[PDB]
Design a protein around this nucleic acid. Sequence first.
RNA 1: UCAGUCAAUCUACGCAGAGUGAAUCGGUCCCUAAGGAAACCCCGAAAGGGCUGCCGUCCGAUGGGUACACGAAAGUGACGA
RNA 2: UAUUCCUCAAUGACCGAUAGCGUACAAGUACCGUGAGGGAAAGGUGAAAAGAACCCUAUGACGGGAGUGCAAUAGAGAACCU
RNA 3: UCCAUGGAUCUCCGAUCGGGAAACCGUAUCCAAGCUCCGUGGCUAGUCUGCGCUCUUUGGACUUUGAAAACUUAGCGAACU
Lengths: 71, 44, 177, 130, 215, 60
Amino acid sequence: SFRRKRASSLDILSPKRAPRDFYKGKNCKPTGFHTKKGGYVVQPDKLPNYVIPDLTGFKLKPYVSQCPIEV
Amino acid sequence: PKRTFQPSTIRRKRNHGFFARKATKGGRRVIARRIAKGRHRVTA
Amino acid sequence: AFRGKEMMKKLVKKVGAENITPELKEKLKACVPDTKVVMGRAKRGLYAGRHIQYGNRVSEDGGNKSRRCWKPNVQEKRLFSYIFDSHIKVKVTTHALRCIDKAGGIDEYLLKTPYQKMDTEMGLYWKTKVEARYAELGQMEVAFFNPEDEAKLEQGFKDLNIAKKDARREARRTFRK
Amino acid sequence: GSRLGRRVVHFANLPIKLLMPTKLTNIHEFALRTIPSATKIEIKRVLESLYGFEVEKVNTLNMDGKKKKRGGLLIAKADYKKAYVTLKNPLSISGDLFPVKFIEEDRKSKVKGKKSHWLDQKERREVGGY
Amino acid sequence: GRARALRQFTLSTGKSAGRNSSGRITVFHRGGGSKRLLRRIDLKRSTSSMGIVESIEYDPNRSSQIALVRWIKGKILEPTTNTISGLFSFSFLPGKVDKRKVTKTLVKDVFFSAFSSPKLAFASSFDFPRIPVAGVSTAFFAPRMRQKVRGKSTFSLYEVQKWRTHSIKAGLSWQSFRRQDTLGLACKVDRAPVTYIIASHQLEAGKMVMNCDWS
Amino acid sequence: TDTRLPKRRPMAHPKKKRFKLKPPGPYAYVQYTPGEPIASNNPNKGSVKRRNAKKRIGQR
RNA sequence: UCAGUCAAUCUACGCAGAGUGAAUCGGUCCCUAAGGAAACCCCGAAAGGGCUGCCGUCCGAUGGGUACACGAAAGUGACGA
RNA sequence: UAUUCCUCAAUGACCGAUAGCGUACAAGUACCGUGAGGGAAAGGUGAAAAGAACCCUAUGACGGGAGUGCAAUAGAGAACCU
RNA sequence: UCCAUGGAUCUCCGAUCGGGAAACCGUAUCCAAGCUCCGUGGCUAGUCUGCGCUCUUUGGACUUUGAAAACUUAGCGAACU
Ligand SMILES: [K+]
Ligand SMILES: [K+]
Ligand SMILES: [Mg+2]
Ligand SMILES: [Mg+2]
Ligand SMILES: [Mg+2]
Ligand SMILES: [Mg+2]
Ligand SMILES: [Mg+2]
Ligand SMILES: [Mg+2]
Ligand SMILES: [Mg+2]
Ligand SMILES: [Mg+2]
Ligand SMILES: [Mg+2]
Ligand SMILES: [Mg+2]
Ligand SMILES: [Mg+2]
Ligand SMILES: [Mg+2]
Ligand SMILES: [Mg+2]
Ligand SMILES: [Mg+2]
Ligand SMILES: [Mg+2]
Ligand SMILES: [Mg+2]
Ligand SMILES: [Mg+2]
Ligand SMILES: [Mg+2]
Ligand SMILES: [Mg+2]
Ligand SMILES: [Mg+2]
Ligand SMILES: [Mg+2]
Ligand SMILES: [Mg+2]
Ligand SMILES: [Mg+2]
Ligand SMILES: [Mg+2]
């Protein structure tokens, strides 16, 4: 969907259009910590866990029927 | 011939950036003047 | 300019606005100094109301006028304090030093001078501290002794000094051993 | 309860938009579009838990939205993130699903313009990137 | 480099080229030399020692020469008194006679709370003032708080004081006392002490060097 | 059943530099062999140099 | 239709869609230089200026680093033509 | 008693698109400058879009007929009253 | 659809938890109290008691005041003419 912006919003610095050592980031959540040697360690307690129950045999549906039944 | 504008993004942000203007009393008046005028680009 | 109001705002924000009744507000309005002090170094010393002045310097024959200033006679001194038993390093004008001479010392000057005339938040702090220590001293009494007790206690102190010296030397030599 | 983990999600809302692959049989990887604040671990765990995929690796890249400028007026679309997911076993897509046949028939309109040896494999793994 | 200086006595400093803290030139015709490192030299020589001159080296920072030198030497019954000859009470030293607090809130209480700590006192930091005892200084005195009911006369040796004769201190500061009120807010065989000194004329390796102290 | 232990995060408190840990005074206690002259630098088996430079040479 | 030193079917031109895959590449991260700034202290009609250390903090590559954390009276990292 | 970053109502021998605020129109925009800063242009079809089906000649109708409409040189694609 | 009142959700900078090339990065604050679930230790073993964290409620510890046109009161204060 096309939406209107200001033409002055092109001046905000982004790492795609910056020198090679510019870092901004995209507000992702962190999962670990930086090392002193330029690496990274992923702490497994900070990873998201998803609780998705079993959907097989469920009787409800995305839409509700609109057949003429009663006032 | 070598012209006068030789671009460098880090130099531009270090001289006319938001936190470079916010650091001294003259630049804070510049920011107030720009906002009062109504400029779209308040800082460089 | 409105120094009384800007000091009263800080004092209210420190002490809590709920703590003060309107009569206490009315009384506190008449202790916070409302003087005209602009220069920075007069808020850090005891100047007794002297300030800088900017005026004209006028030539003798031509009458030509150019700007100049008169500064107060600021000197850095150490003044002795009776309840702290020690010196206080201040930057006083000679006018303040002469007022101290008339009052009878820096402590007596701080007691005698009211709150509005202290001109300074540090002046209020120092007057408050000296008044609290003098109120502490106001509830104490000393008892003197007869010369026979003088001699007895002198002998006791000699005994304890020589015993402490002997025990300290013995402990040092045994720790060496 | 809360002792199970620090980050437990009961109502996920990560939007995943699948891109139509080139071939219908022997699919070894597929691409998708999502919001820029998604992570490789989030995409892999949502795809494993919600749909039942057997995910091997996830590779991401950022894209800028499309823009149009007409001298002062600027209109634009939102930024997105593209992800490549590699499967452990090949999958397939039936032709009878809408709009697969229309996509293939419109794609072939734009592009109009034997010696097998011993021990030669047929369906080899076709994975790009690093 | 042929002979790197000893790494325990080498410091790094830049060049000023005659420019002060403001960045402007104050000393003219300087700048653009060769790179130098600073050597640390013992210019005091206050420690009395004996040494052996090891080597004579080159110092670019000064006109003379320096020399590396290793150094080869260097429960009793207390007199409880119940008799007092007189009581003096400091009740006019405040200058205004008033009662003692433990209630309306007063100006003095407001100024005490506004300047008090973030979260009796006649001891530890400052102790008893000398003024109290000024009419007669060489007399043993016992300070005590004044009680509403008449107190006891028993005085041990620990409770009696006398400024000797030594005292007939430190010094506070007018503007920096509030912060301080606010809480304060031979070695082993493989080692050898060495120093750098300014070498004299006719001083080569293997010689003796003395530092002498007052006698 | 992993008895192995996870890696730990570095702490962010300020750390003292080695120049301030040296005792004060004029004297420096250097390594001394009692028949040999005093060397200014004593590298051992773990003193490696120019690692980034060798990386660049290999890349070229 | 505009632009291209064209009357252009073509195009870096208009419309629509697509395209950039990293433990190792380049950064982020750690460490500092020249330099900048806070705190403490010093000075100043105001605004502000100095000071970065004797016990002292945060940034700053054009340089030094690539599979835990804490401590150091151990070595070093460490260098010219 | 002083002033209007503001709100509500009213008035004008005030202006009427080179005028009135820099801006009646998506303007502190486009554009110029390293930066502080400077700074535009551009209103109107018809009562209602009924905005010209169809035919002929050109690569292509914006042309010549036909038709809508009081009127078609009232036939336009940020522009068509005189 | 719409209106009135009350609710649920309510990203980021300016900006104030620290750093900063504004719209980015890193962040379980700290300490007492009393409660369901949890695991482990110890007794002569039955309505037996004693140790912990995580998350929850109520307090108190550190600090985050803060913008704004003209008017007002003060400080310093020109030159063209
Ligand atoms: K007409
Ligand atoms: K004149
Ligand atoms: Mg928007
Ligand atoms: Mg790019
Ligand atoms: Mg963020
Ligand atoms: Mg990538
Ligand atoms: Mg052309
Ligand atoms: Mg043509
Ligand atoms: Mg073409
Ligand atoms: Mg094109
Ligand atoms: Mg790398
Ligand atoms: Mg520095
Ligand atoms: Mg500085
Ligand atoms: Mg400063
Ligand atoms: Mg800082
Ligand atoms: Mg750093
Ligand atoms: Mg670099
Ligand atoms: Mg080097
Ligand atoms: Mg106009
Ligand atoms: Mg006209
Ligand atoms: Mg016109
Ligand atoms: Mg520009
Ligand atoms: Mg037509
Ligand atoms: Mg008309
Ligand atoms: Mg912040
Ligand atoms: Mg105001």
